[PDB]
Amino acid sequence: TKGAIVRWGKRKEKLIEEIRAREEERNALVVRLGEIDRTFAVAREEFDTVVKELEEARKSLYEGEARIKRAEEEKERLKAEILTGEARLPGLRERAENLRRLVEEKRAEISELERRLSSITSQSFELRIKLSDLEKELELARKDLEKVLAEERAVREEIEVAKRRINELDTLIERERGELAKLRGRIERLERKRDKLKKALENPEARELTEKIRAVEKEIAALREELSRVEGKLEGL
């Protein structure tokens, strides 16, 4: 009927309008999601980079700590060498003083006994034997003194060398520690950037829009099905 043409026609125009509005909304949603997915591409590449760099930094940190431990074990060996050397020095200096004194003593004894041989000159032969014995003893005392003095000089030298090497090691350790502090800063900055990247990657509005787009598309489908029935009605009326 004419009246049914009018009524169904009014229904048709309403359906067309509502479909137009729903498809408008749906396109907007699709655009927004099309920006989110791009942001996730960018962020996921940066995240991959940053966790890589973070691995590199942690490896460098461990290696630096290991080099420091090696340097400090070497430092402790050298400290023990120095303490061992230093504990010998009072004894060596005592020996040297006593040997200088013994040397002077023997020289004076040789002078006195030579004086008696001078004054007397039968049993001066005994004094002459005593003389050669005093000469052997003085000679030995002098050779011992040379040996003690040389050994004290050698111990002092070896102490100085160990101390210089220890200073060297402390400078190496200071350099490593400076690098470790720089790496701890780099790691803190990387960890923070990485946590922000993860948080952006759990945003999670991407799914908030995927489900909503599913719904609005379902409703568009429903409206188009009613529209198709209404059209088929008007096309046979």
Task: Measure the CA–CA gap between 18 and 14, rounded to whole angstroms.
Answer: 6
Task: Measure the CA–CA gap between 237 and 24, rounded to whole angstroms.
Answer: 31
Task: Measure the CA–CA gap between 54 and 197, rounded to whole angstroms.
Answer: 14
* Deposited resolution, Å: 2.0
- Owning domain of residue 15: 2-236
Task: Measure the CA–CA gap between 29 and 208, rounded to whole angstroms.
Answer: 10
Residues 6+ apart with CB under 8 A from 64: 176, 179, 180, 183
Number of domains the chain contains: 1
Task: Measure the CA–CA gap between 128 and 235, rounded to whole angstroms.
Answer: 158
Distances (CA, A) of 8 to 15, 16, 227: 11, 12, 10
Q: Does an H or E element contain 199, and which?
A: helix 124-200
The CATH number of the domain holding residue 51 is 1.10.287.2610
C-alpha 149 chain-centroid distance: 47
In the chain the first and final C-alpha atoms are separated, in Å, by 7
Residue 192 in contact with residue 50, Cβ under 8 Å? no
